[PDB]
Each structure stands twice: as C-alpha cells, then as structure tokens.
Amino acid sequence: VVECIKEITESSRNGKLVFFVGAGVSTLSDYPQWWRLVDKYHEELYGSPKKGNYSSDEYLRIPQIFYNVKGEMAFDGILKDFFQVDKPTNPIHDKILAMNPAHVITTNYDNLIDTACWKRGKYFSVISAEEDVANATSSRYLLKVAGDFRKGFKGENVVLKEDDYLNYDQNYPLISNLMKTIIATHTIVFIGYGLGDYNINMLLNWVRKLQKDSFHKPFFIRTDPSPIENETLIYYENKGLRIIDAASLIDSNEYDYLERYSAVMDLLIESQ
Amino acid sequence: YGEKLKEVFLMLDNNVVECIKEITESSRNGKLVFFVGAGVSTLSDYPQWWRLVDKYHEELYGSPKKGNYSSDEYLRIPQIFYNVKGEMAFDGILKDFFQVDKPTNPIHDKILAMNPAHVITTNYDNLIDTACWKRGKYFSVISAEEDVANATSSRYLLKVAGDFRKGFKGENVVLKEDDYLNYDQNYPLISNLMKTIIATHTIVFIGYGLGDYN
Amino acid sequence: PTNPIHDKILAMNPAHVITTNYDNLIDTACWKRGKYFSVISAEEDVANATSSRYLLKVAGDFRKGFKGENVVLKEDDYLNYDQNYPLISNLMKTIIATHTIVFIGYGLGDYNINMLLNWVRKLQKDSFHKPFFIRTDPSPIENETLIYYENKGLRIIDAASLIDSNEYDYLERYSAVMDLLIESQENKFITKDDEVIDYIYGKISPLFALQYIRKIDLKHVFEYDYHFEVNGTVVRHKNKGFGYMERFFELKESCDERSKLSKKQYERFNALFNFFEKNGVICMAKDAGTLNTSIEINSLAYHGKYDVMKKFIEEQSVSIEDDYKKAFFLACLGRWEESYDLYSNIILNSIDESNGCVYYLSQINRYRIYQSITQAVTQFNGLGLLTFGRHYKPFTDEFLARIEREMTNFNIDDLFNGMPFEFQKKYKILEFLSDNQFLYDDTVKLF
Secondary structure, eight states: OHHHHHHHHHHHHTTOEEEEEOTHHHHTTTOOOHHHHHHHHHHHHTSSOOOSOOOHHHHHHHHHHHHHHTOSHHHHHHHHHHHOOOOOOOHHHHHHHTTOOSEEEEOOOOOHHHHHHHHHTOOOEEEOSHHHHHTOOSSSEEEETTOOOSSOSOSSSSOOSHHHHHTGGGTOHHHHHHHHHHHHHSEEEEOSOOSSOTHHHHTTHHHHHSOOSOOOOOEEEOOOSSOOOHHHHHHHHHHTOEEEOSTTTOOOOTTOHHHHHHHHHHHHHHOO | OHHHHHHHHHHSOHHHHHHHHHHHHHHHTTOEEEEEOSHHHHTTTOOOTTHHHHHHHHHSSSSOOSSOOOSSHHHHHHHHIIIIIOSSHHHHHHHHHTTOOOOOOHHHHHHHTTOOSEEEEOOSSTTHHHHHHHHTOOOEEEOSGGGSSSOOSSOEEEETTOOSTTOSOTTSSOOSSHHHHTSTTTOHHHHHHHHHHHHTSEEEEESOOSSOOO | OOOHHHHHHHTTOOSOEEEOOOOSHHHHHHHHTTOOOEEEOSSHHHHHOOSSOEEEETTOOSTTOSOTTSSOOSSHHHHSHHHHOHHHHHHHHHHHHHSOOEEOSOOSSOTHHHHHIIIIIIISOSOOOOOEEEEOOSSOOOHHHHHHHHHTTOEEEESTTTOOOOTTOHHHHHHHHHHHHHGGGTTSSOOSHHHHHHHHHHHHGGGGSSSOOOGGGGGGGGTTSEEEOSSSOEEESSOOSSOTTHHHHHHHHOSSGGGSSOTTHHHHHHHHHHHHHHHTOOOOSTTOOOOOOOOOOOOHHHHTOHHHHHHHHSSOOOSHHHHHHHHHHHHHHTOHHHHHHHHHHHHHHHTSSSSTHHHHHHHHHHHHHHHHHHHHHHHHHHHGGGTTTSOOOOSOHHHHHHHHHHTSSOOSTTTTTSSOHHHHHHTGGGGGTTSTTTTTTTHHHHO
16 A cells, blocks of 8 residues: 555656546646537537437547538637637646656646646657657657647647547557557556546557566556445456555545545655 | 328338338348347347346445446446456356246247348347247357358358357356457457358348447 | 360369459350359459359459459559458458368469468367368478478378379379369269268168158159169169169179178168168169069058048157158148147247258148148138038138238248258258149150
C-alpha cells in the first residue's frame, strides 16, 4: 500500500515517472463535457431531446449521422461555438507538474496542460500531429494522442467521430509507436481516467494481452464515491494494473471530486 | 386477412414492394440465407443473458447493482467470475439455467417453410434443430471447427456462436469477453465459411437489434 | 493448342478447377469437351455466379483486355493482394477447406504454395484433410525433404519413383502419374480374388435393407458396366477391365476354388450368393440354358387376406421397419388419418439413425397419402349426398386444417437432392420414385 507510494517516489527520483492524464483533470476546471456536445447535435438531428439508457454505440454514433448528412460546416461551427472558452487552472494541474515527470500523455483536446507548463516555466516539446514528431526539438515530451486545436477548430485535426476511432492505426502510426515506446521504457501512473474509456480499456488490453513477463506494472488512481471491491481488485491485478484506491483513505460525498483528487495527489507528494 | 394485407400493400411505400419482390425472386431460385438472432429465441421464453449476468453479480457482493448495470460491466462480470472465483462453477450455473426445454414457436416454422437453403444462427440453443426435425428438412449442423470437413450435406445450419451439443461446458461456446477477442484465432474456418456464404447469396436478417455486436 | 494433360485433368470429373494461370487454354479445353464452367477472375463475377461449378482464375485473365490491371504480375500487385482481391481469397480458402485438393505442375517452392503452407497448416487446428502434391522433377526426392513437407501438411507422390525417364521428357512423367489414376478408376488393376468380392460387396451391401431390386434397374448399380436381362442372364456392355461380374459365377459354380479365401470373405460371399438367389440373377449368358422362372409375391396386400393384417396392426411393435410395414397396411385398409400420424411419428423417430432408406420412403409415402386425402375430400365434398345416397362427411376439420399448415409448399422434386451425399451415392437407385413419371418408360415398349 504505502510501499507502492514509495515505489512511485523511487520512480520519480531518477527519470522513470510518466503521468497519464485524462478527462478527470479536465472536468475540474469546468471545460465543457462531451455529452453536452452529443446532446447539441441531437438537438438539430432529431428535433427534441431525450433521456434514458442507450448503447454506447449510439453515444459514439450520434455525431456520425450529423457528419454524414449535415456535412462539415455545421460540425466545425458547433465545435467553434462550444470550445472557444477560456478557463483557469485547477490546482491538480500544478500538483501533477510539481512531480517533475519525464513525460506526460493526455487524451484531452484541451490546452490547460500547455498553459500550466508555460506558467511553471517547464519548456516541453508538444507533439500534436504527424508532422511534429519529425521536427522534435527536445527530449521531454507533451504527447497529445487525440489531437488538438492548435491550427483551428476543424473536424480533421481531432478524433471525435467513429471512423476516426476505427482508422487510428492508418492515420496516426507514428503517435502510436511513440506512445508504445514511452509506456515500454518508463513507469506509468494513471490519474483522472475512467474505467470504460475505450482509450485506456484497449491500449492496456491489446498491448498487454500479448507480451512477456518483462514489463513494468502501471498504476491507476481511482475516482469514485465508493471504494472498490475485492474481487474486481484481484481480477485487475491479473490484467497487469495496480490500483491505488481513493476512497479507502478519505471519506466524502458524491459531488466532491476535487477533494478526493487533491487528497490523493497530496498523499503522493508528501513523500518528498 | 388477405384483404388487410392488400390494403397494407396499397399504403405500402414502394421500397417495401421492391424489397419483397427481390426477396421472392431470390427465394424462387434457391438463393436465400436467413440470420436468426436473439429475438426468435426470446419469443419462446428461453432464458436471456441478463438474468445470467444478475446471478453472476449475486455470487460476488451481496445484492444486484442498483440502477442500470453499465455499458462495460456486462462483458466484464462473467470474465471476473470465470477467472477469479473459479472455472468449475461456471458449468454448474450454465447447467442450472440453460437446461430447461421449451417448445418451438410458429415463427420458426414460418422461417423454415420459405426454403432457406442455408441458415446461419448466433443462438447457442438447439430449437431450430427441433423445427428442422419436425418439418423434415435435413441440415448438417456445424458446431465447432472439427465439423467443416466432415459435413455430409450441401445445406448448412451454421452455429457461429457455438452450441451445447457436445456438453454443457464453458469451452464449447463463446460467452466470455476473452472468448470474443480470441475469436479469429480459434474459429477461422467457420468465419471463412460464413463470409463466403454471405458473399454469394442474399442475406435476410431477423431477430436482431440495430446495435448488436455481430 | 491444348496439350493432352488438360484433357486428362478434365477426364477426372473434377468439381472445381483453380488455376494460377493468366492463360485461357484451360478455358478452351473445358469448352471443347462440352463441360460448362463459370469463370471467375474479377470481384464482380463472384456475385453473379450463374453456375454450380467455378473455374477460379486467382491471378486473373486478359479476357477483358491486354492490360496490366486485370492480372497480378508486378510486386505492387503482390503486396496489396489482400486489400485488392478480398472475395477471391475467401472463396479459395473455403474451397480448399471443404473439398480434396490435388496440386499439379508446381515446384516445391513457387511463391503461391508458400502462402498455402503458411496459412492452412499453422493457423488451423487438426481439422484438416491433407492435400496431395504431384512432383515432376527428374532427380528423385531425397528422403529428408519428404519428412519436412509431410509434416508441413502435404502428401507427395513423386514421379521419379514410377517411371525412369530422361531429363527433358516431362510429358511422359505427367502422363504416367495421370494414367496411374485415370486408368485405375477401378477396372484394370483388379487382379486378386480379394478385390472382386469386395468390389461387388461395396456396391450391393447398401441394398440389403430393401426387399427386392428390379433387374432392369440393377444396371445403375454397376454404372452401366453390364446389361442385366429380365429372364436372368447378364451381358458385358462397357466393363473394359477384368470382369468383376463374370468371375463371381465362376467362383460360385466351383467347390474348391472358394478355398483360397480368408476367413472373412467366406461369409461375405455367402451373403452375396443369398442376395443374388433371392433377387433372381442366375448365371452367365453363354451357360444360360433352362431358365424356368416362377414369380412369387409374398406381401399380404396382394393376396387379399384382410383378416391377418387386422391382427398384425393391433400388436406390439419391435422395430422401425415393422412400423413402416404397419403404416402401409393401415393405408391399404383405408384408415388414412391414422396412417398419416404413424408416418409422421416414424419420420420424427428415425431422423437420428443411420442410412435413411426408411426416412426417404416414409417421406414419399406421406406425400402420396396427402395427395390421396386431398383428392378424396375434393370429390366427396363435391358430389355431396349423390355419391352413396348420404351426406357422408368422412374426416373432421382438425385433420384438414393441420395438413394444410404441415404441407405448405413442400416441393418434392428436390427431396433426393437434399439427402446426404453417402445416401446419394449408395441409393441413386431409388431416384425415380420422387418424379411422377416413373412408369413412362414401359408404355414406350407397349407400342
């Protein structure tokens, strides 16, 4: 338990700590979520909103029909209206940056991590697309796997639709290869990520399903109001991941993600 | 009843008329293949795969998950049961619910009466076999990999998902998540045969949703 | 022009021919002999089909023009093969997995064989039928290579171990290998007496279940090799090899010639002798002297003894064949509704069992009884009271409603085609029962 935190400190000691961040480090600063976008497309697609349970297929498909019939101007316009908002940095970002990791990998389309890096003075090499890897300028990297809006708010610079998710291996091969090498060479700690997200439910599943026992186990920071159960913990230990529970130490209510995040990150930082 | 159908045809969109004409033309030449799914199985009150998941979730923990389960727990729960709690109790549970015998529904006979040269099913229950027995149509059942070479017929009842003919065991059927990812490596010939059948025939889907995996 | 090897390949009655050849000589050879094949060389041709046989030109042909895009020659066309031609690969896999493949005219390397040996063997489980290979190199294959290519999943029939030929005489080697098969479709190789009895048995044993086989019909048993006379003689008509039917009578007549047989052939010969005596085949044509024949029908339906049948029906059953006879007796007595139920029960019960002579005949009888009940009810309810001076309604609405749903469609012209392949090979003999023209070959001769 605590020895895992000690191992994390040893990893952060020399050169081998890499933080994998996700949507949990983005909701804190109130960057608008994806489901509100999904509802916005539905507003013009069908005519009236709905609610209830539907397949995650439909969740990811609703943008696809809008892409097919409306075209591309409407998609770009909706994206431009929805994301063109400036937000400040919640303290989790600087909490991550104070750890001084060798590399940090993100799936967010956001720019909060870049702004935080600029604020802290840590000059990195942001890699955002195919052409950027050829013109790398340093060693430490800021890899945005899912693409970003540096050039503009268009539908071709980011992965949002179904086809883009199904054509990743034929449109971003260098990014995939660099990510594979990064996870192979350095110890990985996951924070702020969900457990049903296709990005970190396949990129551990497929890669670790075929490998040998010479691999470094990655770490995941949980975010859920209830503490995890035992059987799930064991079966995930089988899959090759270690889980640092966020509800086995602190007790709170069901709308206080920020405090659990801060508690876990402060616990990790305390061993300095 | 015929006049009601005539009126329906009168208000039918011409696309439906064209589709039924094409289906009849294909059926007259013996070039039709039906795809039976879950709906034709739940018509006859056969146990579904949501009660099985709920008992799988009952053995662990104390009570069923309050609210909708998840979009991810559905496939993960049986794998957890098989992996961490034991590979032997899986067969016991499967024999517990998947043994009850139920009789055939009229839709099975309607499907079979159309001269369906080849039938492809993703059902792991042999009721269509009973319908074939009663209607007197000889179909060669392809359960596993070792039956594509010894098929003693020119008509195929291809059970892609695998059946329980050889026994109620967890290795003869594809139910778990691990049995889905490692599918193109364990069942090559069956997939190849299904693709070939689909390529050179006319496929009619029945009893499927609009967001199923297959 | 077309070389004789193409003719020898086609004379082997193959179900499918797959060639990696850009050429069209195989198409011309198929055209000349009158065999019709559907040519598939592009993706579109997979959809249309229009035949039950395929000449799968995997590498394409120049039929649509002499252009580089209809054939696979360059390296760019070999690395994008899977992406460019999806359907042809799948058809090739299915055909190779279902049938038996006999490679001809291939080197042991030669690119194309390597993908087959890579995918068919390694990725598949042990559910394979091993393909054959015909090698035609001058030097004999060394024994160390043979073990490797056998373990990879190929049988090899080397030509150098068959006939000694010079370096450049390829045609003689191919001819020797092909005539070892086409010559021995199985008439000329037969020399020992252990082959004659077994060859007769392998074709007559299936007909042990039935009670009588027509003589004018036994020709189809022996693929037109002999004419079987109605009187009880046989005549040689097409058998070009050592006469397997002539030797049987020579064995039958003698007393000590039978002695040089194993302990197992004696019983088989006795069984064949009993079958031939029961059916009525007597002896050779030349030795056929006095041939007085008495026809004796044993079925109780012919003799018109209605008292014994009634006792028989109301008695415990012992086997499926006994129930099949009871079904015919009930139909003879006129109790059609019970006969239909008994036939349906027999069909349900006997579908699990082995060779379906009972199943097929029961299906035919059920359909005939359905025709009879329909034709009876139409005339009864048409003529009404005028028939027997009484408004007699024989059957109830339950049966009339049930059979209509049970007998929907049910084309019978494909009943023999849907039976298992072993039944089709063994029992081609009963193929004429389904067609409603069976006797239209004897009124021919009444003229």
